[PDB]
Design a protein around this ligand. Structure first.
Ligand code: PEB
Ligand code: PEB
Ligand code: PEB
Ligand code: PEB
Ligand code: PEB
Ligand code: PEB
Ligand code: PEB
Ligand code: PEB
Ligand code: PEB
Ligand code: PEB
Ligand code: PEB
Ligand code: PEB
Ligand code: PEB
Ligand code: PEB
Lengths: 113, 177, 248, 164, 177, 177, 177, 174
């Protein structure tokens, strides 16, 4: 006699606010040139965006911060990651040393800090 | 004019609003210490690009399990989405410092955030820790005790505004715990 | 304080002849003699240790505590000397958890189970200020040990009838078992540990194994659940002449 | 055997069609819940001779009259036939935790049970009291996990309602 | 254990509130009608030996198989244990009427009582019947409507004490069912 | 019908033994390989119309004495019956691959298929060729080495599923051989 | 309980064999580095009451809902019991560091620790933080990477003992999870 | 079971900044010695493998002969690549303090490939033991032709660390 999808979709629409997953945020900009008639504040609304490119300046640098920790490679031990779905051919110079990892090696370039 | 800045955030659409020179001069004498509070916003939002970029990387700096195989900051996009929310949390706290009210902080940012993180399986114990780094930056930028960067301010004491922006960061901590 | 099981369906508690022998000035006690002596020592060995089945080369380290017991005829000093032994800590302290050690001190030295979390946490407050000997001498020099056993009788599991909590009778029945039951069968792992800290009770078949012969050991179980629902609000109505009154 | 696999196949074999997208969607639920009910099964498998001893004593505790001369537990060779028939029921619950449905309890324990126990004067309320004791002697994080006890105590509730 | 004043301060401790004048008007009427609470509990403990023996033998009257061979009130050994138990139940509900909160009846008397009775073999449907007789005996002494034994009170209603003690007797049936 | 889980049950029921330990390790590998099996059943069922038309035509072009007058696939009545006699056999194979055991294929298709085709007068050699082509189409859709259609998968090795479905097709050939 | 020498004995009692020289080189090397094991034990027990004070109060920093009303570390009685537990986990790990074997940590401290903390209602995601804050502080003084309190050791590699303690502190974390 | 450089095909750079180095230099015991350990190697990385391969030629001169495995100038150039790639993974392993990235990305499958490609495995024992004995002499500043300015102190435990890492290469191709 009841509709379960209607009266639970309505119950989840009034309790949950409409504003969470839309990723908008009040961006405040202050302008000041020293004078009195130069001092606006602009509290406008912007949907902020997940910046894809600058995460690799954080995800990689912390992945080599934790590579060089002697006492955070123990008490923080990573899980046992499986390799991918690559098929073994039979010749070891393609199986053990594939073309994606052919002649790759780390070069360390120290400088000041 | 101050009530109209709630209306551009309620409407869920990009609409801009601002103050004049004389309307701010009437606002800075209606609210007491209003020049100090606009220095408290400007000390944060000039450095808001560095505060989230240090606190998210500082969360990995004490917990490298988030970048593990199986971690919550992995597959190149979760790290981008982690920087997006710490940008959002720093926007809504600095708007609450600008308004002097946490009533826009709760229902627009913290309402239902606790259920959203456990629906995704976001570890809330690390997201406390990324806010508490940002709380430690916000009392250092306001009191001008930051080591690497000191902005020249007009002299005086701003201890009540630093404790106010401490208390707005605890409400982010209390909602997601 | 009537207790329909106690001297009816069980035996009588063992012990020394009287407590007036201490006021006798030419003796210390009614002198039992070494057939009337060692069969009382058999009942202290079966009670402080469970049924531990101590060997001949483990009783030789308890040679000194009996030789004092057959001169100073105090039973409480014999129990105190056996609980500070190596043979009491290598069975009940060494490979067990902390609330397993505590729940066996209530069995071996009081014949009851612990009634509370607040009573149980105060025994770990005495562990911090003197170790395990501060737990043992505070049980022995308590008021509850004085007005049930004294210097005269062995500390036995007593069916009282007038327990201060009903749950205290339940945890006594889980702790003692049958006579073919020792207390090393769990691998550590206190049996009463979940029910003390939460506030729930025990399982009915584990209690009715340890009841005596002739006391309906197990019947009364409906084939639905064995515990109570704390969230249930039932309607229990009384008939008056006119209708039915739900005094809730 | 009633299972997840044999239900969607027989529903499609009776209609004469191929396994569709809804028939594969239910085998996905056999993957998301195999973890909980299989470590409920190996916990029961490694500790079965201690549980059926404790369970079979709960029927001779409540129904202690069965050891009187005349009843079904009259002599010694009939007492271990009760412990055998309780070990049969705990072994079939281990199979229903492996298969994923009530198949091995239906086809091997329940079908034809009431006709057998009535003809041989076996009270079905004491094949129940040993099962209902195992169901409430189950602690939630100690014996198994949280969802492993939900599965284990649902095949015990199935056998209780089927014998009553 | 708690009483009626301790029950209020553990409700306010979940909110970290102060017990102020909104919450205090329930406690200001607990002391205002506090003479009648004392006037009602010596109406019960003055008649408590007559109340137990009438309730237990009134349960034998409606069920004569309790005193045949195989009943669980059969011999003198089992009948004195049933008379002791109904005096314990009436003792703990006189503590609970005096305090004004059913805490001490629920943890000391009633917690774990269902598992004693299904291990000792005590019938619980007739045990509820002995409690339900002395519920009706207790409401007749409080409202002074018993057929013998008119006690000397003062005039007014005690109709909220008679249904408070009827709910304490209903918790005994709900805990052994 | 026995699936892959009730097969090890009857293997351990004849020993009156519990399932746990080493006999549980094959079933944990069945769950871990379970997404490949659902990915494999989907690839055969999606191409089922082209699998039976290309295997019945391939039988006809190699032995053209079926569309001769008097032949067993001569008229339109006999042609549509052969396109359904092989569509049933493909349907019962995918039941056996979805389950993990051939007990749905043997008791509902194969038990009585040899004695059915003798009374009907069906050529036992042409029907073997019709299901041996369909076997060779099955191992090409599971291993994604079809020359006419390529489906999108994740990377990995799935020769064990392709070798298992070729064992099932050798039962429907050996039943009528 | 067992130590590092007794585990070699009870593994070769199970094979009925004398401990030969092929099993002594793990034990003859144990007494060679046995001085620097003892040198690194008392860097933990001399800094112990600051480590429990830091690891509990850093767990309050990450999870601020522990000190809310209804939190687990709310009142003074519950706060001191949390400080007493982290000293106990530190005490039993510093037996297992001294013994070189995780026997005595497992069956006196970790025996039934998970079922205790569920029954009390202690949160398991905050109690694994307090054994992992002090995990990092226990690999501090072994590796001598401490910010304050530099301790005067002798020079050489101690990363075998630093990795052994990090095995022991996650043995607690695998026990209460 | 390799390390936290699991990042495959995303921009591959991963530097460590200035104040983040103070999170690392207050975390590594003798971290100043270890940063001077790898700087004595990778500053002289071109001179080492030019001397490591030609030291193998100077004792085994049949590699330049036709039929030998350092004729046909690309095949000579592959050995100076693989002389350096072994050195490049060791210098990362001394910096990280573990050899798990060296065992899984470099040494894994090296024995089967050298017998398949016709590489003489016993001469590559000799060419990497030169690079063992070279980098011991760099890290203790006993290199005769060139000395590097350092702060005063000892580096014995890092010198014993790298002799284990070059012996892992000799174990993996044996
Ligand atoms: C205005 C609304 C709004 C917010 C309040 C925030 C909160 C928020 N974050 C995410 C979404 C996310 N949030 C995180 C965040 C984290 N994970 C971690 O490990 C860190 C501790 C932490 C921050 C650094 C991640 C990683 C995702 C992506 C989840 C995923 O990809 O599965 C989502 C998406 C859920 C959905 O769309 O269904 C939302 C609403 N972002 C918003 O758009
Ligand atoms: C959005 C634009 C906008 C601003 C940024 C502010 C900027 C601002 N604040 C002050 C003026 C001031 N600013 C401060 C603030 C501080 N002093 C400290 O030592 C702390 C570091 C810091 C507090 C966090 C104080 C104490 C005064 C003087 C009191 C006052 O004028 O309110 C002045 C006057 C300077 C002068 O004397 O000429 C100005 C221009 N007002 C605006 O309209
Ligand atoms: C820890 C302190 C401690 C001691 C120092 C000893 C001392 C000691 N010995 C005996 C008790 C005794 N001691 C002896 C010994 C002897 N009698 C002789 O004729 C021989 C010369 C001598 C042997 C060398 C005998 C025979 C008894 C028992 C006396 C009896 O039968 O009542 C007793 C009394 C206890 C009992 O009744 O058995 C005590 C305290 N025992 C202790 O527990
Ligand atoms: C694979 C599934 C499977 C089962 C579940 C059991 C079911 C089962 N149990 C019994 C048989 C029995 N069950 C009981 C049990 C009891 N009698 C009592 O006193 C109490 C009521 C109770 C103790 C628990 C007894 C005594 C017999 C033997 C009856 C007899 O031999 O007359 C029998 C008759 C044949 C026999 O003697 O074993 C069968 C088929 N057997 C199976 O093959
Ligand atoms: C696979 C089948 C399977 C079951 C059906 C259960 C059943 C079960 N429970 C217990 C044993 C127990 N069960 C409990 C119950 C609890 N403990 C707590 O901490 C909670 C408070 C409460 C659950 C809510 C207790 C306290 C014991 C030990 C006392 C006893 O019953 O002997 C035992 C005896 C074995 C032992 O010594 O532990 C068995 C077989 N366990 C199983 O392995
Ligand atoms: C089978 C045998 C048998 C009995 C023993 C009685 C038992 C009995 N007594 C009362 C009921 C009562 N019993 C008493 C008790 C007493 N009255 C006094 O004046 C004394 C002081 C005190 C001890 C005698 C009171 C006060 C009531 C209820 C008031 C009333 O009777 O009107 C009730 C009614 C309860 C109800 O309605 O559910 C019953 C069934 N009846 C029986 O059928
Ligand atoms: C130390 C022991 C102790 C007691 C036993 C009681 C005794 C008692 N009861 C009441 C007082 C009273 N008692 C009643 C009660 C009733 N009247 C009825 O008609 C009903 C049958 C019955 C209900 C149960 C009423 C209605 C009052 C007056 C209202 C009040 O002042 O509270 C009073 C106050 C009036 C006076 O002082 O005379 C006292 C002292 N108080 C005590 O301090
Ligand atoms: C005389 C007439 C005549 C035919 C009709 C075909 C029939 C035919 N097709 C295939 C062989 C095959 N048939 C298919 C099926 C298909 N391939 C696709 O691209 C489609 C998606 C789908 C149905 C149209 C597949 C997938 C193979 C394997 C190789 C491939 O085509 O990629 C085979 C080889 C079977 C075997 O190895 O025994 C034969 C005989 N050949 C003939 O000689
Ligand atoms: C409801 C319907 C339903 C499906 C259709 C499948 C869909 C499906 N397939 C795979 C996942 C996979 N599927 C295959 C199978 C293959 N890959 C190949 O290269 C071969 C061509 C082919 C047969 C060997 C492989 C190898 C994986 C990778 C993971 C694994 O090996 O289990 C996964 C897991 C990876 C992911 O989640 O993205 C899923 C959900 N599962 C379902 O629940
Ligand atoms: C919310 C508030 C808050 C705190 C209270 C601290 C609590 C705290 N301290 C440390 C971190 C530390 N704790 C100590 C321990 C001590 N330091 C000394 O010099 C003494 C000997 C000893 C007790 C005073 C040390 C030395 C570190 C630095 C990292 C380390 O070397 O272990 C860590 C992180 C450990 C890690 O993850 O690596 C945390 C969370 N941090 C916070 O965010
Ligand atoms: C009574 C208690 C007791 C102690 C406290 C120690 C004290 C102690 N430690 C070491 C000795 C040592 N201690 C260390 C340890 C270290 N050096 C470092 O730079 C690291 C930071 C740290 C690693 C944890 C090393 C490497 C040695 C030398 C090895 C050895 O001689 O055994 C020695 C041997 C020689 C010496 O240096 O004095 C002694 C006596 N021994 C004891 O019997
Ligand atoms: C000489 C100059 C030069 C370049 C410009 C790049 C260009 C480039 N990037 C990648 C490789 C990659 N490129 C990205 C790209 C991104 N990661 C993100 O998070 C963002 C969404 C996006 C940056 C805008 C990722 C994730 C990889 C890893 C593999 C992949 O996904 O393609 C590859 C493949 C080889 C490799 O994995 O390194 C190449 C050639 N590489 C170079 O050598
Ligand atoms: C190596 C491990 C590692 C870390 C521990 C964190 C570093 C880190 N820095 C700060 C602390 C801070 N972070 C900033 C932020 C900035 N400072 C500036 O000059 C810029 C404008 C801006 C972006 C860099 C400020 C102003 C402080 C407070 C003052 C200070 O300590 O520098 C805090 C919080 C309080 C504290 O513990 O000091 C942490 C956890 N990041 C890491 O990588
Ligand atoms: C044709 C025959 C021929 C040889 C047999 C070798 C000679 C040779 N020199 C070194 C040894 C070395 N080679 C170097 C390398 C260098 N020194 C520097 O100052 C530069 C930076 C860098 C490139 C020249 C160093 C530092 C040593 C160790 C110290 C030394 O012996 O000079 C070794 C390794 C040590 C050992 O003997 O085990 C060998 C085999 N070179 C040859 O040409």
């Amino acid at each position: 006699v009841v509709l379960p999808v209607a009266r639970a979709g309505l119950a989840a629409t009034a309790k949950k606010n409409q504003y969470m997953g839309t990723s908008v945020a009040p961006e405040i900009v202050l302008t000041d040139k020293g004078s009195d008639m130069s001092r606006k504040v602009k509290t406008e609304d912007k949907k902020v965006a997940a910046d894809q490119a600058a995460a690799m300046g954080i995800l990689a640098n912390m992945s080599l911060y934790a590579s060089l920790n002697p006492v955070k490679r123990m008490t923080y031990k990573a899980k046992e990651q499986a390799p991918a779905y690559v098929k073994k051919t039979g010749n070891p110079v393609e199986d053990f040393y594939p073309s994606s990892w052919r002649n790759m090696a780390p070069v360390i370039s120290l400088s000041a800090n | 004019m101050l009530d109209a800045f709630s209306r551009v955030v309620v409407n869920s659409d990009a609409k801009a609003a601002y103050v004049g020179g004389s309307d701010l001069q009437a606002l800075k004498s209606f609210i007491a210490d209003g020049n100090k509070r606009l220095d408290a916003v400007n000390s944060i939002v000039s450095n808001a690009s560095c505060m989230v970029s240090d606190a998210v990387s500082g969360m990995i700096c004490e917990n490298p399990g988030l970048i593990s195989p199986g971690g919550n900051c992995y597959t190149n996009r979760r790290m981008a989405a982690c920087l997006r929310d710490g940008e959002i949390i720093l926007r809504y706290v600095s708007y609450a410092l600008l308004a002097g009210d946490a009533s826009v902080l709760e229902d627009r940012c913290l309402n239902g955030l606790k259920e959203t993180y456990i629906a995704l399986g976001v570890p809330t114990n690390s997201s406390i820790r990324a806010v508490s780094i940002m709380k430690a930056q916000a009392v250092a930028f306001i009191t001008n005790t930051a080591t690497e960067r000191k902005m020249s301010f007009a002299a005086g004491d701003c201890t009540s505004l630093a404790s106010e922006v401490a208390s707005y960061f605890d409400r982010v901590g209390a909602a997601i715990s | 304080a009537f207790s329909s099981i106690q001297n009816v369906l069980t035996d009588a508690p063992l012990g020394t002849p009287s407590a007036m022998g201490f006021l006798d000035e030419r003796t210390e006690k009614p002198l039992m003699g070494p057939s009337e002596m060692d069969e009382l020592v058999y009942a202290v060995y079966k009670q402080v240790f469970g049924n531990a089945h101590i060997m001949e080369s483990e009783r030789a380290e308890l040679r000194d505590a009996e030789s004092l017991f057959r001169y100073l005829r105090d039973v409480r000093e014999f129990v105190r000397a056996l609980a500070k032994s190596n043979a009491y800590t290598s069975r009940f302290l060494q490979g067990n958890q902390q609330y397993r050690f505590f729940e066996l001190n209530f069995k071996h030295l009081l014949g009851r189970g612990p009634r509370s979390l607040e009573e149980m946490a105060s025994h770990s407050a005495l562990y911090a200020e003197g170790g395990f000997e501060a737990v043992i001498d505070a049980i022995l020099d308590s008021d509850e040990y004085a007005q049930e056993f004294g210097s005269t009788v062995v500390p036995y599991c007593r069916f009282k009838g007038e327990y201060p909590t009903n749950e205290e009778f339940n945890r006594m029945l889980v702790l003692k078992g049958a006579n073919s039951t020792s207390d090393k069968a769990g691998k550590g792992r206190s049996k009463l540990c979940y029910s003390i800290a939460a506030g729930c009770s025990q399982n009915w078949l584990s209690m009715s194994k340890a009841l005596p012969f002739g006391t309906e050991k197990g019947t009364g179980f409906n084939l639905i659940s064995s515990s109570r629902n704390p969230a249930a609000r039932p309607r229990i109505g009384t008939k008056i002449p006119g209708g039915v009154v739900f005094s809730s | 055997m009633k299972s997840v696999i044999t239900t969607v196949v027989s529903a499609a074999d009776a209609a004469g069609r191929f396994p569709s997208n809804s028939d594969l969607e239910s085998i996905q639920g056999n993957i998301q819940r195999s973890a909980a009910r299989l470590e409920a099964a190996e916990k029961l498998a490694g500790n079965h001779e201690a549980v059926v001893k404790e369970a079979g004593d709960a029927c001779f505790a409540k129904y202690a009259y069965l050891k009187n001369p005349g009843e079904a537990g009259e002599n010694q060779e009939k007492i271990n036939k009760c412990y055998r028939d309780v070990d049969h029921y705990m072994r079939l619950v281990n199979y229903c935790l492996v298969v994923g449905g009530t198949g091995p309890l239906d086809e091997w324990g329940i079908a034809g049970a009431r006709e057998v126990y009535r003809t041989l004067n076996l009270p079905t309320s004491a094949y129940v009291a040993s099962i209902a004791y195992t169901r409430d002697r189950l602690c939630v994080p100690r014996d198994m996990s949280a969802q492993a006890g939900v599965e284990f105590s649902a095949y015990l509730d199935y056998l209780i309602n089927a014998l009553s």
